[PDB]
Amino acid sequence: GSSGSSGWYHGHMSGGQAETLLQAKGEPWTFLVRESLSQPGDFVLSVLSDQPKAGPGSPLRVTHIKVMCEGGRYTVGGLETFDSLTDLVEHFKKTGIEEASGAFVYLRQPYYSGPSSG
Amino acid sequence: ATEQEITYAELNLQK
């Protein structure tokens, strides 16, 4: 029943859709990789924080980290060009990501594409 | 107008 090669990689999505999707599920520390919109062969790393924007009744704040792609590698903010998103993401899944302000984005739930129905 | 241009986080590194 739909058994094959699954993963977190989505394909096409906009920072506007992610925030809606990620939140829709309601899973903290949920990251999802999507293709850029106005960037050259680039991607965007969207992660759902376990912290609400307001309080009890508001959606979880998301973090869009511009993902740079150098030919066949990936990086964010720094030069560290991972062999692939699988490594760049995994490394963060254990270590995590640090935002300028200080926020620590953790990736434990590999947001899967999901059967787009409806 | 009233567009939705989400902002990205400016991670911090050696830089």
PDB file of C-alpha atoms in Angstrom:
ATOM      1  CA  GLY A   1       0.000   0.000   0.000  1.00  0.00           C
ATOM      2  CA  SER A   2       2.156   2.838  -1.307  1.00  0.00           C
ATOM      3  CA  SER A   3       5.413   1.127  -0.342  1.00  0.00           C
ATOM      4  CA  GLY A   4       8.475   2.611  -2.011  1.00  0.00           C
ATOM      5  CA  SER A   5      11.205   5.227  -1.658  1.00  0.00           C
ATOM      6  CA  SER A   6       9.848   7.829   0.761  1.00  0.00           C
ATOM      7  CA  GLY A   7      11.551  10.699   2.562  1.00  0.00           C
ATOM      8  CA  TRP A   8      11.400  14.314   3.708  1.00  0.00           C
ATOM      9  CA  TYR A   9      12.282  15.769   0.307  1.00  0.00           C
ATOM     10  CA  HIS A  10       9.160  17.460  -1.060  1.00  0.00           C
ATOM     11  CA  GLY A  11      10.088  19.128  -4.337  1.00  0.00           C
ATOM     12  CA  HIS A  12       7.986  22.238  -4.911  1.00  0.00           C
ATOM     13  CA  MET A  13       6.786  24.557  -2.143  1.00  0.00           C
ATOM     14  CA  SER A  14       6.728  28.205  -1.068  1.00  0.00           C
ATOM     15  CA  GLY A  15       7.577  29.720   2.302  1.00  0.00           C
ATOM     16  CA  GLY A  16       3.884  30.539   2.431  1.00  0.00           C
ATOM     17  CA  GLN A  17       2.685  26.970   1.943  1.00  0.00           C
ATOM     18  CA  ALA A  18       5.216  25.429   4.328  1.00  0.00           C
ATOM     19  CA  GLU A  19       4.121  27.483   7.337  1.00  0.00           C
ATOM     20  CA  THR A  20       0.607  26.247   6.570  1.00  0.00           C
ATOM     21  CA  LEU A  21       1.584  22.616   6.001  1.00  0.00           C
ATOM     22  CA  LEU A  22       4.065  22.202   8.854  1.00  0.00           C
ATOM     23  CA  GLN A  23       1.549  23.785  11.225  1.00  0.00           C
ATOM     24  CA  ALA A  24      -1.276  21.690   9.780  1.00  0.00           C
ATOM     25  CA  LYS A  25       0.407  18.536  11.079  1.00  0.00           C
ATOM     26  CA  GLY A  26       1.132  20.104  14.455  1.00  0.00           C
ATOM     27  CA  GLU A  27       4.452  18.348  15.014  1.00  0.00           C
ATOM     28  CA  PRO A  28       7.277  20.161  16.853  1.00  0.00           C
ATOM     29  CA  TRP A  29      10.819  20.065  15.473  1.00  0.00           C
ATOM     30  CA  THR A  30       9.479  19.235  12.012  1.00  0.00           C
ATOM     31  CA  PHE A  31      11.764  20.170   9.118  1.00  0.00           C
ATOM     32  CA  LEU A  32      11.009  20.070   5.391  1.00  0.00           C
ATOM     33  CA  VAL A  33      13.178  20.661   2.323  1.00  0.00           C
ATOM     34  CA  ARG A  34      11.688  22.539  -0.628  1.00  0.00           C
ATOM     35  CA  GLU A  35      12.856  24.229  -3.831  1.00  0.00           C
ATOM     36  CA  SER A  36      13.516  27.975  -3.875  1.00  0.00           C
ATOM     37  CA  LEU A  37      11.211  30.476  -5.576  1.00  0.00           C
ATOM     38  CA  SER A  38      13.385  33.395  -6.680  1.00  0.00           C
ATOM     39  CA  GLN A  39      16.800  31.885  -5.960  1.00  0.00           C
ATOM     40  CA  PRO A  40      19.045  30.190  -8.556  1.00  0.00           C
ATOM     41  CA  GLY A  41      18.985  26.430  -8.074  1.00  0.00           C
ATOM     42  CA  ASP A  42      18.543  27.000  -4.346  1.00  0.00           C
ATOM     43  CA  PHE A  43      16.352  25.541  -1.601  1.00  0.00           C
ATOM     44  CA  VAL A  44      14.690  26.572   1.661  1.00  0.00           C
ATOM     45  CA  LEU A  45      14.855  24.817   5.031  1.00  0.00           C
ATOM     46  CA  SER A  46      11.586  25.188   6.941  1.00  0.00           C
ATOM     47  CA  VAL A  47      11.372  23.876  10.504  1.00  0.00           C
ATOM     48  CA  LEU A  48       8.445  23.985  12.930  1.00  0.00           C
ATOM     49  CA  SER A  49       9.452  25.125  16.418  1.00  0.00           C
ATOM     50  CA  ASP A  50       7.758  23.744  19.531  1.00  0.00           C
ATOM     51  CA  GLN A  51       7.053  27.340  20.552  1.00  0.00           C
ATOM     52  CA  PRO A  52       3.737  29.049  19.696  1.00  0.00           C
ATOM     53  CA  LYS A  53       3.647  32.520  18.143  1.00  0.00           C
ATOM     54  CA  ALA A  54       1.238  33.758  20.814  1.00  0.00           C
ATOM     55  CA  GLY A  55       0.126  31.044  23.215  1.00  0.00           C
ATOM     56  CA  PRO A  56      -2.472  28.296  23.762  1.00  0.00           C
ATOM     57  CA  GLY A  57      -4.342  28.449  20.467  1.00  0.00           C
ATOM     58  CA  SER A  58      -1.767  29.825  18.040  1.00  0.00           C
ATOM     59  CA  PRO A  59       0.265  28.018  15.346  1.00  0.00           C
ATOM     60  CA  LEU A  60       3.896  27.020  15.886  1.00  0.00           C
ATOM     61  CA  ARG A  61       6.451  29.517  14.583  1.00  0.00           C
ATOM     62  CA  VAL A  62       8.433  28.364  11.548  1.00  0.00           C
ATOM     63  CA  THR A  63      12.062  28.994  10.602  1.00  0.00           C
ATOM     64  CA  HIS A  64      13.059  29.527   6.970  1.00  0.00           C
ATOM     65  CA  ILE A  65      16.807  29.023   6.565  1.00  0.00           C
ATOM     66  CA  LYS A  66      17.982  29.851   3.043  1.00  0.00           C
ATOM     67  CA  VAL A  67      19.791  26.752   1.776  1.00  0.00           C
ATOM     68  CA  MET A  68      22.583  27.414  -0.719  1.00  0.00           C
ATOM     69  CA  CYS A  69      23.508  24.753  -3.274  1.00  0.00           C
ATOM     70  CA  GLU A  70      26.965  24.741  -4.860  1.00  0.00           C
ATOM     71  CA  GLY A  71      26.717  22.497  -7.907  1.00  0.00           C
ATOM     72  CA  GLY A  72      26.183  19.282  -5.984  1.00  0.00           C
ATOM     73  CA  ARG A  73      26.612  20.412  -2.384  1.00  0.00           C
ATOM     74  CA  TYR A  74      24.603  22.358   0.192  1.00  0.00           C
ATOM     75  CA  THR A  75      25.274  24.989   2.855  1.00  0.00           C
ATOM     76  CA  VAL A  76      23.646  27.612   5.076  1.00  0.00           C
ATOM     77  CA  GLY A  77      25.205  30.869   6.230  1.00  0.00           C
ATOM     78  CA  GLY A  78      28.642  29.286   6.280  1.00  0.00           C
ATOM     79  CA  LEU A  79      30.844  27.743   3.599  1.00  0.00           C
ATOM     80  CA  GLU A  80      30.478  24.220   4.987  1.00  0.00           C
ATOM     81  CA  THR A  81      29.299  22.539   1.784  1.00  0.00           C
ATOM     82  CA  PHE A  82      27.863  19.115   2.608  1.00  0.00           C
ATOM     83  CA  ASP A  83      27.950  16.339   0.008  1.00  0.00           C
ATOM     84  CA  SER A  84      24.147  16.403  -0.011  1.00  0.00           C
ATOM     85  CA  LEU A  85      21.065  17.574   1.886  1.00  0.00           C
ATOM     86  CA  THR A  86      20.986  14.132   3.502  1.00  0.00           C
ATOM     87  CA  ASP A  87      24.235  14.933   5.307  1.00  0.00           C
ATOM     88  CA  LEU A  88      23.691  18.660   5.840  1.00  0.00           C
ATOM     89  CA  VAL A  89      20.305  17.931   7.411  1.00  0.00           C
ATOM     90  CA  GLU A  90      21.348  14.833   9.357  1.00  0.00           C
ATOM     91  CA  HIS A  91      24.236  16.735  10.943  1.00  0.00           C
ATOM     92  CA  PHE A  92      21.706  19.283  12.203  1.00  0.00           C
ATOM     93  CA  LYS A  93      19.275  16.552  13.254  1.00  0.00           C
ATOM     94  CA  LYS A  94      21.807  15.584  15.922  1.00  0.00           C
ATOM     95  CA  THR A  95      23.636  18.871  16.486  1.00  0.00           C
ATOM     96  CA  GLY A  96      20.897  21.312  15.536  1.00  0.00           C
ATOM     97  CA  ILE A  97      20.830  24.789  14.015  1.00  0.00           C
ATOM     98  CA  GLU A  98      21.655  28.073  15.745  1.00  0.00           C
ATOM     99  CA  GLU A  99      19.848  31.231  14.630  1.00  0.00           C
ATOM    100  CA  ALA A 100      21.543  34.631  14.787  1.00  0.00           C
ATOM    101  CA  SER A 101      19.238  35.639  17.641  1.00  0.00           C
ATOM    102  CA  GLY A 102      20.030  32.355  19.362  1.00  0.00           C
ATOM    103  CA  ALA A 103      16.982  30.222  18.607  1.00  0.00           C
ATOM    104  CA  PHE A 104      17.898  26.538  18.352  1.00  0.00           C
ATOM    105  CA  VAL A 105      16.059  24.778  15.526  1.00  0.00           C
ATOM    106  CA  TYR A 106      15.950  21.011  16.035  1.00  0.00           C
ATOM    107  CA  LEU A 107      15.046  18.563  13.270  1.00  0.00           C
ATOM    108  CA  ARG A 108      13.719  15.191  14.425  1.00  0.00           C
ATOM    109  CA  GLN A 109      10.622  14.732  12.263  1.00  0.00           C
ATOM    110  CA  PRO A 110      11.465  14.467   8.540  1.00  0.00           C
ATOM    111  CA  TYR A 111       8.380  16.183   7.127  1.00  0.00           C
ATOM    112  CA  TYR A 112       7.335  13.822   4.333  1.00  0.00           C
ATOM    113  CA  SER A 113       5.697  14.964   1.096  1.00  0.00           C
ATOM    114  CA  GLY A 114       2.392  13.276   1.875  1.00  0.00           C
ATOM    115  CA  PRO A 115      -0.452  12.197  -0.434  1.00  0.00           C
ATOM    116  CA  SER A 116      -1.770  15.509  -1.761  1.00  0.00           C
ATOM    117  CA  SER A 117      -5.511  14.826  -1.837  1.00  0.00           C
ATOM    118  CA  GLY A 118      -8.581  17.053  -1.807  1.00  0.00           C
TER     119      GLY A 118
ATOM    120  CA  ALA B   1      -0.182  44.616  -1.468  1.00  0.00           C
ATOM    121  CA  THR B   2      -0.829  42.716   1.762  1.00  0.00           C
ATOM    122  CA  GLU B   3       1.506  40.120   0.255  1.00  0.00           C
ATOM    123  CA  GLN B   4       3.058  37.256   2.218  1.00  0.00           C
ATOM    124  CA  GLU B   5       6.853  37.416   2.009  1.00  0.00           C
ATOM    125  CA  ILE B   6       7.974  35.262   4.936  1.00  0.00           C
ATOM    126  CA  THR B   7      11.356  36.242   6.372  1.00  0.00           C
ATOM    127  CA  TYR B   8      14.340  33.900   6.630  1.00  0.00           C
ATOM    128  CA  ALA B   9      16.524  33.380   9.699  1.00  0.00           C
ATOM    129  CA  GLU B  10      20.059  34.782   9.637  1.00  0.00           C
ATOM    130  CA  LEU B  11      21.929  31.868  11.214  1.00  0.00           C
ATOM    131  CA  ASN B  12      25.262  32.642  12.877  1.00  0.00           C
ATOM    132  CA  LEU B  13      28.617  31.028  12.098  1.00  0.00           C
ATOM    133  CA  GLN B  14      32.372  31.638  12.064  1.00  0.00           C
ATOM    134  CA  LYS B  15      31.645  34.471   9.631  1.00  0.00           C
TER     135      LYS B  15
END
